[PDB]
Amino acid sequence: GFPRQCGDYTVLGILTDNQDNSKAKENAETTLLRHPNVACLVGLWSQNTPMILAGLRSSDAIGKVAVVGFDEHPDTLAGIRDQSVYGTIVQQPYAFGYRSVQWLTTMAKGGEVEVPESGMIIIPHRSITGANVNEFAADIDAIKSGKGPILSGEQQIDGSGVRVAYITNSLDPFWTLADAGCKRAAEQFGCEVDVQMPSSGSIEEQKRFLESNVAAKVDGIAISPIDPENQVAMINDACKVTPVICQDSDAPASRRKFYLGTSNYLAGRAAGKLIQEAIPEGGEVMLFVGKMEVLNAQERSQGIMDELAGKPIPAILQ
Numbered sequence: 001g002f003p004r005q006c007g008d009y010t011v012l013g014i015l016t017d018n019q020d021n022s023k024a025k026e027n028a029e030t031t032l033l034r035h036p037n038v039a040c041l042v043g044l045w046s047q048n049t050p051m052i053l054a055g056l057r058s059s060d061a062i063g064k065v066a067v068v069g070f071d072e073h074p075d076t077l078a079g080i081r082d083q084s085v086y087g088t089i090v091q092q093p094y095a096f097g098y099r100s101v102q103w104l105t106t107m108a109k110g111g112e113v114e115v116p117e118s119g120m121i122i123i124p125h126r127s128i129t130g131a132n133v134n135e136f137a138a139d140i141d142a143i144k145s146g147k148g149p150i151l152s153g154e155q156q157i158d159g160s161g162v163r164v165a166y167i168t169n170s171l172d173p174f175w176t177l178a179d180a181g182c183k184r185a186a187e188q189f190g191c192e193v194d195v196q197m198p199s200s201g202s203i204e205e206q207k208r209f210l211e212s213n214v215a216a217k218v219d220g221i222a223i224s225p226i227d228p229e230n231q232v233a234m235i236n237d238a239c240k241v242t243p244v245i246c247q248d249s250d251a252p253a254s255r256r257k258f259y260l261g262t263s264n265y266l267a268g269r270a271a272g273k274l275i276q277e278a279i280p281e282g283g284e285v286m287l288f289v290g291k292m293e294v295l296n297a298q299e300r301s302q303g304i305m306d307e308l309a310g311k312p313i314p315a316i317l318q
């Protein structure tokens, strides 16, 4: 129940808008009006921070309340640059593609990939603030012009003769950065990567990619399954002949070797840290999201509150 005391912070509630932009803006406006002491507004989904800023502008309150968000909507980055948004937490699709190619090429060459018993490798979020937002935009520019960073540093891997496949779940812009990551790793390691995108986002399209990769005898496959419960068989058939890993979305019931993805819970803890840096003295916090029935909204808000409360992480590391 709300309000909830989290250390020196009071989470007043989680306001839902069902992705209606004008309702998201209204929620921000009524929050400012009914809670004159509110200190930070937090947008849990990509659109919420732009509508928080819209509500602050209508209330003449830009800069009077701190703002923290998720993702890199252009209005969110503009707000970071003009200091009305303290920072935002973004995913790293480029590292999804790059590391998938890196780890599949390493296994194809006999090397080992350290994977925990959970079978999950967490690709780190990125925290963007006013202090590093120009470094972020420069990184994105470099990536788009085909000169993205070599995440593997000095580590040499001879991937010539290795052929791997990288299967997305759609033609979303998220996959354009991952595609650049695949091609940068392939150039770095000398391997060949087939980036395969299901144009209409159906499992039947992914099934034909999987069967083509088996017929081509690829050395490894990374896939973001569209409907994991109903793709266990087709993934297992590929696993019989070649290593399959999951990326971005997981099929934990299948024979896939491991999963790499984002931890929305740890992304929430990172946003909790941005809140703490935006208002070190504490105060009232309001969260905003489309709906709370979605898993990533539950994980992001729970991570925020656990971080503000200083909740100790029951963790395994070895």
Ligand SMILES: [Ca+2]
Pocket (backbone or CB within 6 Å): 080, 081, 082, 083, 130
């Ligand atoms: Ca600036």
